Enzyme design. Structure first.
Site, PDB file in Angstrom:
ATOM      1  N   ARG H  96      29.653  -4.037  55.402  1.00  0.00           N
ATOM      2  CA  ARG H  96      29.351  -3.770  54.002  1.00  0.00           C
ATOM      3  C   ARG H  96      30.354  -2.804  53.381  1.00  0.00           C
ATOM      4  O   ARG H  96      30.725  -2.957  52.210  1.00  0.00           O
ATOM      5  CB  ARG H  96      27.933  -3.227  53.893  1.00  0.00           C
ATOM      6  CG  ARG H  96      27.690  -2.442  52.649  1.00  0.00           C
ATOM      7  CD  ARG H  96      27.644  -0.962  52.914  1.00  0.00           C
ATOM      8  NE  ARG H  96      27.782  -0.208  51.681  1.00  0.00           N
ATOM      9  CZ  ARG H  96      28.277   1.020  51.619  1.00  0.00           C
ATOM     10  NH1 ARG H  96      28.688   1.622  52.723  1.00  0.00           N
ATOM     11  NH2 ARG H  96      28.369   1.643  50.453  1.00  0.00           N
ATOM     12  N   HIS H 101      34.190  -1.550  49.331  1.00  0.00           N
ATOM     13  CA  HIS H 101      35.234  -0.560  49.092  1.00  0.00           C
ATOM     14  C   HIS H 101      36.641  -1.075  49.346  1.00  0.00           C
ATOM     15  O   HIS H 101      37.601  -0.452  48.881  1.00  0.00           O
ATOM     16  CB  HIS H 101      35.010   0.685  49.960  1.00  0.00           C
ATOM     17  CG  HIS H 101      33.695   1.358  49.731  1.00  0.00           C
ATOM     18  ND1 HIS H 101      33.147   1.519  48.476  1.00  0.00           N
ATOM     19  CD2 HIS H 101      32.815   1.908  50.601  1.00  0.00           C
ATOM     20  CE1 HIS H 101      31.987   2.145  48.583  1.00  0.00           C
ATOM     21  NE2 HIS H 101      31.762   2.390  49.862  1.00  0.00           N
TER      22      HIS H 101
END
Lengths: 117, 132, 132, 129, 129, 123, 128, 130
Positions: H96, H101
């Site tokens: 994730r 990011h």
């Protein structure tokens, strides 16, 4: 207060020592005054204060009577407890201190009167 | 202001009298009467200066002197006298202190040195105040 | 005590110096230098007396003298000097104060009166103290 | 008495240096040097008051204070300062731990603007002895 | 641990502002606001060191400190700071008093010029961790 | 001993819509030698000056210096410390657990963001 | 290199918010497009924090106590104006509310009026 | 506990959300809107999972984790989670991170390998907490 610690520490570190007084609250800080034949270096005196501070586990104010104000010399003579030095030197220091203080009170009374309304 | 002029005048009168009594210096060290006059007029100069200094301290509220010599320190800390002159006057207070609190351990060679080279310290201190 | 011995010696020295300098009086009101000598030696007598008073008060714990004058009053209220001599010493201090700090308002006839009739006030003070 | 005279002088000097340094505000909250000066002079004021209080507690034999706040509690219980002024002086004891930041600078401006008169009121009570 | 990380940050920040404000000794001479800044940031340094010391004493269960100075002795007795640095940190404890000032200003200058490294030495010894 | 009943009472009597009270200083671990550190959460953030004033009010009542923390405006670092080492003195278990996971989550996110900064200043 | 790639992400994420939020006829009605905008707003928000943390890092401006502190540290050193600092911290709060727990008139308001703040922040930073 | 039951509903609500948006998957790998969606709803599951991990780590007084990993590690170290499920979720919050990011080094294969075989992992954690 272990007065002997104070006496020893100042005898081992101050050349030509003549008087030691404990004054202040203990007769915050332990207030101690010394008189030697010379005035002490101001920085050296603060450092010697901190050595006493470490050994007594408390804050220490070390006053050199040869360079201290008349007002605070008067306080040492009035409220101080002599821990070292001869009886003659104590009485000499008192007479010089007390006289200078009465002269200073004459000079500055108008100032103290104006600042105390 | 009234009191300062008189003190200033007293300093000048005392300076002159020291000079007239010390004349050439010759018989000063061998006559106790000249010593007395010079020494007593030096004390007058010092005390008059302290009175000028404390009067300024009081009117401008610069502090409470902890000793006589401190009256000049308060003038220096507020930049109303130069500190070389502050220390000269402070040295003069210490000599008064000696001449008053201890009659005989005055060393008169200091006294004549003050007469010959340091009386203008009084007139410098007096040279600064007036213009203020 | 050693301190009182030296102050008594200083009082002795200064009294004769006053006497020796005032001679017969014929020139005293005239000459500023003999007035200065006499006045400065009166101050020393006063200070030597004040120091004895301050020394006795401190070391036998009769109190803390606020000023030179109260130093003599505390000796009187513990009955070690007579009241009359206390006030004479207190008034001699005040005459000196006018004599050294404000000589142009000094009544020299008071000084001549003190010189001629009141120098035993000092010597009476020394005879009491010494006869402890 | 010299101890009380010098503490009152120290309080006056610091109150003046606080007012002189704070000015109208303006630049105060943007120069850390003027914040440091004000903050350290406030502590000086608090300690000088504590020293006055403890000296009075001792010479008047009102008791032994166990803490800085007890110094003012003893004066209030003997009616030498009012309880409101006692509580104001205690508040300032808290300022010691504000040196050791901008969450706090309005605390300091609040104290500067509203509580320096408590210092001047305490010394006016002490001068009237 | 956040407690020691932030104390090390404040010590570094205070050492910087002492150096920035003191300069080459320039006019730190007759301007009371930079001496106040220097004095108060030295206090902040001292307090941060005491707090670091107390956190280590209690995390490492070396004892309960009886004083600000005893806080450094407990670290010294367990050899996490040497004795000279312990004694140097202790003599900084004395600094918080002379805030409460002109021949004591030589004391301050002495510390600024010779004892800043003592704080620095202490945080690098702690950064071992 | 610390009088936690007067702390509770004093804060309740002075903070509108109070929800949590935490003791979290040295006093919460073992009352070492020292601030009393107290954290509160109310429905609104408190006025900062008003919060300092109530700190001094508790300080007077407990005869010790007091640090009163408003968790609604406190840092993530200091919120983490209150949930980590704090002792709840008032409020529901639901409000405590809501505050804890919100805090703990925010703190682990901040550790991800700032780790390189932390690493550099302690090496 | 870190800052340039973060600015690239912010630019391509903003353009992605703009493309998917078209006229906003259905933003409020379909969620998959809410999901895209919300995550790309989060990405924009995250990337600004990294830029800020990288700058604070390379200049030792302090240790952030919270995510908002990253922008407070830049403002206290005059690297962003405090109006821009307060706007960026407003977005940090919305990231917080999106991540840990969002009324969406707030997201439509930021999308339509507050993206400029992302674009002003990158225009400043790169200018130095 | 209400915090547990609210998260668990969040996990179940977001898994179905993941599954509906990616029905066939024809246009999954070239329309990256339906994946902004799947990546978002993926980390809501992770976020939610981390919060019970955090919540349980605090209530049972096992320590306060400073990272999402340490949270799953402490539950495994006290034997309330099967340990490879600790890794299966430690690897999911790691997927994730890269997902949100660093969205260009996102393999996008594991995306679909995880909505494929590892989406159940959320819901063994979910029944293990019940």
């Amino acid at each position: 207060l272990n007065e002997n610690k104070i006496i020893k520490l100042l005898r081992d570190n101050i050349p030509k020592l003549q008087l030691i007084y404990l004054f202040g609250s203990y007769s915050s800080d332990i207030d101690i005054a010394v008189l030697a034949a010379d005035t002490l270096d101001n920085i050296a005196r603060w450092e010697l204060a901190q050595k006493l501070a470490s050994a007594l586990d408390s804050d220490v104010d070390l006053v050199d009577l040869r360079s201290a104000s008349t007002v605070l010399c008067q306080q040492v003579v009035t409220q101080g407890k002599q821990l070292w030095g001869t009886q003659q030197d104590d009485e000499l220091f008192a007479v010089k201190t007390i006289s200078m203080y009465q002269h200073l009170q004459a000079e500055r009374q108008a100032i103290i009167d104006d600042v105390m309304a | 202001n009234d009191i300062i002029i008189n003190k200033i005048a007293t300093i000048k009168r005392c300076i002159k009298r020291i000079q007239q009594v010390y004349g050439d210096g010759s018989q000063f060290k061998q006559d106790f009467t000249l010593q007395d006059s010079v020494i007593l007029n030096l004390q007058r100069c010092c005390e008059a200066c302290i009175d000028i200094a404390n009067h300024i301290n009081r009117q401008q509220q610069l502090g409470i002197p902890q000793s006589s010599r401190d009256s000049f320190t308060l003038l220096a800390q507020n930049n109303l006298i130069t500190q070389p002159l502050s220390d000269n006057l402070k040295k003069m207070v210490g000599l008064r202190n000696i001449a008053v609190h201890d009659a005989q351990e005055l060393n008169l060679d200091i006294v004549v040195h003050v007469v010959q080279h340091h009386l203008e310290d009084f007139e410098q201190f007096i040279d600064v105040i007036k213009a203020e």
